Every structure is written in C-alpha cells, then in structure tokens.
Amino acid sequence: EIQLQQTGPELVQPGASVKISCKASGYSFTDYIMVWVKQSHGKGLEWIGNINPYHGRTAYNLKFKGKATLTVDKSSSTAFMQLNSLISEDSAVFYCVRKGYVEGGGLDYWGQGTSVIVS
Amino acid sequence: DIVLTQFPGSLAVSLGQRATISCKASQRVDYDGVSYMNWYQQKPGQPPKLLINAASDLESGIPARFSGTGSGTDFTLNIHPVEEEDAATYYCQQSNYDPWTFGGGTKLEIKRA
Structure with missing residues (x-):
C-alpha cells in the first residue's frame, strides 16, 4: 500500500505564506515524481506542478508560477510545497499525488489533502 | 496547453442503464499508438480515485x-x-x-x- 500522509489544516492571514508537507511510504521515494493539485471549493481540480525527488527537478503550471515552490527531502521521504503572497482566493484543498513516470504514467495514489484557509 | 472539455457537466441515469461521459481534448494526446488519457472518480469529502x-x-x-x-x-x-x-x-x-x-x-x- 502506498501512503501519502499530508500535514494538517492551516488558517493563514493574507499576505503571508504556508508550507504544507506530505510524507511518502510504500515504495522507493525517488522512483516517482510528486505532483500537487489545488482542489478549490466545490469545483474541479487544478494542477500545480511536479517534482522529481531524485534530482530535485521541477516543472510548474504557469498559473501557479511564483506562488508555489516545490521541494523534497530524501532522508525523510517528504515532499513539501510553499505558497506565498497568500490571499482569499488561495483558500482551497491541496493534494500531493505520486506519478509513475517509469511505471505506466498514472497518478496512482493521492494523499487525503490539506485545507488552507486564508482569512 | 491542451485543454480538456467534459460534456455534459451533470448527468442523471437510471439504475442498470448505461452512462456515457465524454471528454474532448484540444489537441491530440496520442503518441506511439498510446493515448495518454486518464480517468478519476471523486466522491464528496474524498480525494480523487484512479479508474x-x-x-x-x-x-x-x-x-x-x-x-x-x-x-x-x-x-x-x-x-x-x-x-x-x-x-x-x-x-x-x-x-x-x-x-x-x-x-x-x-x-x-x-x-x-
């Protein structure tokens, strides 16, 4: 079983920045890319960007460029993402999901998600 | 970027009947005979599930x-x-x-x- 433990819920004041995380387990961490998604309230999902945990490589959706930064820490198998310049519209649920690039190309396992409230 | 459009946005079907959900890409997502389209299901209060x-x-x-x-x-x-x-x-x-x-x-x- 693959496991994606994300950090807990956050309430943040506008203008500042949160830094959610997501611990993986159930497979070798560096084998697959970690992708992040914004599930705004009562709507469809939005891709934010992926990161190769091996070399730290990164690629972002442009609508979220400059807002979210993806990082990784191999020794503790955790992928963290940071959001800055937070505002009312950033209020949403953020998931981390694993993507098997060399396995068959699917975002197989998602984490439960993190609820960030900006207010 | 390739935009995906799903129709319709809501559908009501009777038990035992067939439901058909469409998805249109803006550009081809084929490569080597392999279409890179995935489908997920999401129930309220739950993360999406791969189908x-x-x-x-x-x-x-x-x-x-x-x-x-x-x-x-x-x-x-x-x-x-x-x-x-x-x-x-x-x-x-x-x-x-x-x-x-x-x-x-x-x-x-x-x-x-």
Whole structure:
C-alpha cells in the first residue's frame, strides 16, 4: 500500500505564506515524481506542478508560477510545497499525488489533502 | 496547453442503464499508438480515485462495468450497468504535454423510484 500522509489544516492571514508537507511510504521515494493539485471549493481540480525527488527537478503550471515552490527531502521521504503572497482566493484543498513516470504514467495514489484557509 | 472539455457537466441515469461521459481534448494526446488519457472518480469529502489510465486500462480493483475508449482528441468513459455507488463526479486528465490538465468534471446522478 502506498501512503501519502499530508500535514494538517492551516488558517493563514493574507499576505503571508504556508508550507504544507506530505510524507511518502510504500515504495522507493525517488522512483516517482510528486505532483500537487489545488482542489478549490466545490469545483474541479487544478494542477500545480511536479517534482522529481531524485534530482530535485521541477516543472510548474504557469498559473501557479511564483506562488508555489516545490521541494523534497530524501532522508525523510517528504515532499513539501510553499505558497506565498497568500490571499482569499488561495483558500482551497491541496493534494500531493505520486506519478509513475517509469511505471505506466498514472497518478496512482493521492494523499487525503490539506485545507488552507486564508482569512 | 491542451485543454480538456467534459460534456455534459451533470448527468442523471437510471439504475442498470448505461452512462456515457465524454471528454474532448484540444489537441491530440496520442503518441506511439498510446493515448495518454486518464480517468478519476471523486466522491464528496474524498480525494480523487484512479479508474482508468492510458485510455483503456482498468486499474486493479476497479469493477469491470467501467470502461474507457477513444484516441486522438475524443474520449469517453462508459459505465454499464450503472449502480448506486457510482454516484460521484468523474474527471479526465491528459499527460501528453505540460502542463498536465484535467477536464471540468461531470457529476453523475442515479434515477430511482
């Protein structure tokens, strides 16, 4: 079983920045890319960007460029993402999901998600 | 980027009937005979669940009443026969080019007595 433990819920004041995380387990961490998604309230999902945990490589959706930064820490198998310049519209649920690039190309396992409230 | 469009946005089908969910890509997502279209299911208060990858591959553990077909820019997800636990929202997602993108989603409702 693959496991994606994300950090807990956050309430943040506008203008500042949160830094959610997501611990993986159930497979070798560096084998697959970690992708992040914004599930705004009562709507469809939005891709934010992926990161190769091996070399730290990164690629972002442009609508979220400059807002979210993806990082990784191999020794503790955790992928963290940071959001800055937070505002009312950033209020949403953020998931981390694993993507098997060399396995068959699917975002197989998602984490439960993190609820960030900006207010 | 390749935009995905799902039609319709809401659908109501009777138990035992066939539900067909469409997904249109703005550009082809094929490569080497392999369509990079995935389908996910999302029930309220839950993270999305993978149903089919690469257009037509059913992920293990997923009931065989679900099937996916299509190539190029036209894709459909079929559920036949539809059951009650199939009430949920379904999203398509392509992985051909960057950025990776999802369709708007289609909410399926079951018609009963």
